Design a protein around this ligand. Structure first.
Ligand SMILES: CC(=O)N[C@@H]1[C@@H](O)[C@H](O[C@@H]2O[C@H](CO)[C@@H](O)[C@H](O)[C@H]2NC(C)=O)[C@@H](CO)O[C@H]1O
Length: 129
């Protein structure tokens, strides 16, 4: 599913992402936009043999099992395929686990690049949330 920006903002807000581990909602909309263009089916293979999955582009070396990643740890305890559904429940639960690690939201390259220190007002403008 390719989410609409406000549609995605509402689903994140409904799921407790606004302020999760001190990360306001606009943070999460901004990184979803840059990481996958709001597409739950987005996949990106890395040089190291790992692959990034879904809306949040979660990596198969540490968080999920895709069965072809060398030295994989599967910390979210899921199949990477579960990160590609239109339904965001499992993706959200795993993104919540990812942000508890020491690096917080800096775990996401797109957040570090396009969102950190930025004015993120525009990502939720007009969503009425
Ligand atoms: C969103 C995602 O899947 N991000 C990735 C980062 O988690 C991953 O960072 C690595 O995360 C581990 C788990 O918290 C850390 O123990 C490890 O220190 C770490 N490393 C760094 C190098 O910042 C990176 C790199 O594997 O990949 C991103 O895809």
């Amino acid at each position: 599913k390719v989410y609409d920006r406000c549609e995605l903002a509402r689903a994140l807000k409904a799921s407790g992402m606004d302020g999760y581990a001190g990360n306001s909602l606009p943070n999460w909309v901004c990184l979803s936009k840059w990481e996958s263009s709001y597409n739950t089916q987005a996949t990106n293979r890395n040089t190291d043999g790992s692959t990034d999955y879904g809306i949040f582009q979660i990596n198969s070396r540490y968080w999920c099992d895709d069965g072809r990643t060398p030295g994989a740890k599967n910390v979210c305890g899921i199949r990477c395929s579960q990160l590609l559904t239109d339904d965001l429940t499992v993706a959200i639960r795993c993104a919540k686990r990812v942000v508890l690690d020491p690096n917080g939201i800096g775990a996401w390259v797109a957040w570090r690049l396009h969102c950190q220190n930025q004015d993120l007002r525009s990502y939720v403008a007009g969503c009425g949330v």
